[PDB]
A paper describes a structure:
MR1 is a monomorphic major histocompatibility complex (MHC) class I-like molecule that presents ligands to Mucosal Associated Invariant T cells. Unlike MHC molecules, MR1 does not constitutively present antigens, but is found in the endoplasmic reticulum (ER) of all cells in a ligand-receptive conformation. The potency of known MAIT cell agonists appears to correlate with their ability to form a Schiff base with MR1 Lys43 located within the A′-pocket, thus allowing MR1 to egress to the cell surface, where the presence of a ribityl moiety in the covalently bound agonist allows for an interaction with the MAIT TCR. MR1 antigen presentation at the cell surface is tightly regulated by ligand availability. Although previously described MR1 ligands facilitate translocation of ER-resident MR1 to the cell surface, we describe nonmicrobial ligands, DB28 and its ester analogue NV18.1, which retain MR1 in the ER in an immature ligand-receptive form and competitively inhibit stimulatory ligands.
DB28 has a terminal carboxylic acid, while the NV18.1 is its methyl ester analog; thus, without undergoing reduction, neither is able to form a Schiff base with MR1. To gain insight into the molecular basis underpinning MR1 down-regulation by DB28 and NV18.1, and despite the very low affinity of the interaction, as judged by SPR, we were able to crystallize the MAIT A-F7 TCR-MR1-DB28 and TCR-MR1-NV18.1 complexes, consistent with other structural reports with low-affinity ligands. Both ternary structures were determined at 2-Å resolution and exhibited unambiguous electron densities within the MR1-antigen binding cleft and at the TCR-MR1-Ag interfaces. As expected from their chemical compositions, neither DB28 nor NV18.1 forms a Schiff base with Lys43 of MR1; however, both ligands are clearly visible in the A′-pocket of MR1, as evidenced by unbiased omit maps of the ligands, indicating strong sequestering of the ligands within the MR1 antigen-binding cleft. In addition, the uracil ring of DB28 and NV18.1 adopts a position reminiscent of the ring structure of 5-OP-RU, whereby its positioning is largely governed by a network of contacts that include hydrophobic interactions with the MR1 aromatic cradle (Tyr7, Tyr62, Trp69, Ile96, and Trp156), as well as H-bonding to Lys43, Arg9, and Ser24 residues. Interestingly, the orientation of the side-chain appendages of DB28 and NV18.1 within the A′-pocket differ from that of 5-OP-RU: both side-chains are constrained by an intramolecular H-bond between the amide NH of the side-chain and the carbonyl oxygen of the carboxylic acid (in DB28) or ester (in NV18.1). Further, the two side-chains lean toward and form H-bonds with Arg9 and Arg94 that protrude from the base of the MR1 A′-pocket. Changing the terminal carboxylic acid group of DB28 for an ester in NV18.1 causes no major structural changes within the MR1 pocket between both complexes.
Author numbering:
A (entry chain H): 1 to 244
B (entry chain G): 2 to 201
C (entry chain A): 0 to 189, 196 to 270
D (entry chain B): 0 to 97
Amino acid sequence: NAGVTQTPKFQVLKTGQSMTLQCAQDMNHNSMYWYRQDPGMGLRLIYYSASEGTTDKGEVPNGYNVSRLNKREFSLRLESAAPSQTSVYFCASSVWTGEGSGELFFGEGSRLTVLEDLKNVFPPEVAVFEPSEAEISHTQKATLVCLATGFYPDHVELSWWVNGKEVHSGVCTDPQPLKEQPALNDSRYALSSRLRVSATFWQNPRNHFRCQVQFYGLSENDEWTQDRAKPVTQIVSAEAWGRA
Amino acid sequence: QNIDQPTEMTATEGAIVQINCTYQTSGFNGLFWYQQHAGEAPTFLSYNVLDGLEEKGRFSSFLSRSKGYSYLLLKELQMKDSASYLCAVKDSNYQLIWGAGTKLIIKPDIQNPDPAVYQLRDSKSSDKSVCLFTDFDSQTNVSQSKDSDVYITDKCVLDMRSMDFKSNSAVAWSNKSDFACANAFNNSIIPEDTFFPSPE
Amino acid sequence: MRTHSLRYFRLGVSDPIHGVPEFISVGYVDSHPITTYDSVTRQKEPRAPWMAENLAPDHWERYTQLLRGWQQMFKVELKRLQRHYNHSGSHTYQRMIGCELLEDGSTTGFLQYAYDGQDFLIFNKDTLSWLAVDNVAHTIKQAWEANQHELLYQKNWLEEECIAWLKRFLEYGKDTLQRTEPPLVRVNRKTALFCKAHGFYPPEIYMTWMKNGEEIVQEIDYGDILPSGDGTYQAWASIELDPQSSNLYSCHVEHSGVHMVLQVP
Amino acid sequence: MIQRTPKIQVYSRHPAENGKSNFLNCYVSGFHPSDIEVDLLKNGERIEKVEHSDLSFSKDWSFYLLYYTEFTPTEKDEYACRVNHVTLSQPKIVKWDR
Ligand SMILES: COC(=O)CCNC(=O)c1cc(=O)[nH]c(=O)[nH]1
């Protein structure tokens, strides 16, 4: 009962590169769809398959092709990636197409960024900053801050780890990244997150805090020619210990 | 054919909000509402094809075919309702026309505001100084930096579940020498009673 | 405007003869086929010239995809029916949906299914329920009535969408659909008197015999309204002559607001 | 299972007159299921160039068809329509009567 499963979650591409997005549904549905979502407008259908063995163009089919391999799978193909294809792609399915009131079931989405060259791709710098002593004495709470800075494109997942376990309570991460140079079209990004715990928890010297940023970047087959290190997919982290 | 809904709406926790959707389409075979949390998949909320109001928990959806308009009504708003709400209409050829979506922002009800600007501890691996504006009321707005070497993030709501406690905060940082938390949020209108602890 | 109707049929056959299509769907405005699709061509095509002339190829492409999906749905539904009937061999599944726009401005709408050419399920859009003829249909009714939204969608399509399509098609083909060709009526002897009309459009016509000013429906033999092949129709009605007494027999024909009387000398 | 036998009616498009061109119609209706074979006969021989409309659907779930051919009625020529259906043990021939 996985519903709709699409991969990959993130992908950076050079102009002219090929790419295939996978999508499978285990709901025994007949209709499957591929959408792209862009800021400022509604979902636009690329291709759809009303039933197994038939496909048809949507509203924006140019630059894409699909293959309804079977009842379960419906792949999206970008043969020659273009910068205009930078988008978040969503695969969906429904029981039938001609069913009037049938709703769509969506996959998690695939974020694609297509770049003329990869020389502006950077992993994030990650740093943790320990709580203010004035906050501790004024509120009996302690806020740690994690800063992920200088990264591009915006393909990151930030998480906090307390004593080897990932935590979500007491955590707030910026819902949108900050452009470090708002005027530039290719500006690198910054992202902040806070973890707030009680003063008692922070003052245990054996409590261990870690902020972790998974970055999705280049892979083996991506050509690299710059002087700096190749910005491959990687995890960058920083840590702090509690202070008595 | 076009679908129209407001770009953004802001309401306070516990209140009621009505998200409008008007459509002009070639025929009509039903109107859908979907909820989409940031970075996640849209999920189905409701379907209306005849006139009237249908309730589903805290959410109710209304439709008037003659006026070509529908609203999604959210009562007793909670922070988890913060999301984009998408309306979509099926036309005479069973094609879905999607609205651009309404981003719903929810202001938490801050029970005991304690606005303060704190200096976090430096990291030995970073040249940055970090400042935290926190515990202010939801009416306060955080303005972006007007200094090119100062970075200021928008306000964020965190929830300490074990203590049933919510608070707003925004972060500012820089590596320049004249940077100080006393002046980091000078471009924002901050509460008059904002606590600035003495520097060391 | 006279009364007009739009309706779409579907036919599914479970074990068809090697040449026969598994699935067929045809639409009609009143007596004129307007569209066709089957499992062999896999294409929805116009069957009236005024349909092809007013609907762009974009329309036929979209509905070709819909009919291909509706074809697979129909096969799945027929498979379920025949398994639950525990029937072997070839069996038929049929569907009819449509609407009427009456002369006085009122509207009707209907949707029903048949198995082996007999009523199976009948939709009531006022009570939003399905009438089941047996317990196989009763099982389908309970599953369909559990999906309340689909019932509402069908009510809206019958009352709003179908009527709008019909008005659109009536304008497209008004030269054909809204014309009037009056009948040519004659009487002859074959003993019985035969009142015969031909060359008329629309096909709706009322023919009856009156004896001394009174109508005896039991004594009259009514013929079918038949297509002549040129777009007009023909019909007849006969009554048996009394050999022992003379009476005043007169044929009465009613067509498109005009009444005719042929008194037999 | 209820199978319904075809109703077979043969007639001319216009009131027939000898030596005047016309069309011979064979209207087959009310049958179920849909498979059916129809032939127009001239003196007992099948006519080659015979046209027919597409299978048509009636409200009562039965089907109907119109087979037709162009001809000229003569005094000596006799015409008929031959129909075979699953409800028929042998082909049923209906002659054109006028
Ligand atoms: C359940 O919704 C419908 O039934 C929609 C209306 N039918 C059609 O639009 C239609 C077209 C056609 O060519 N054949 C057919 O059976 N139905």
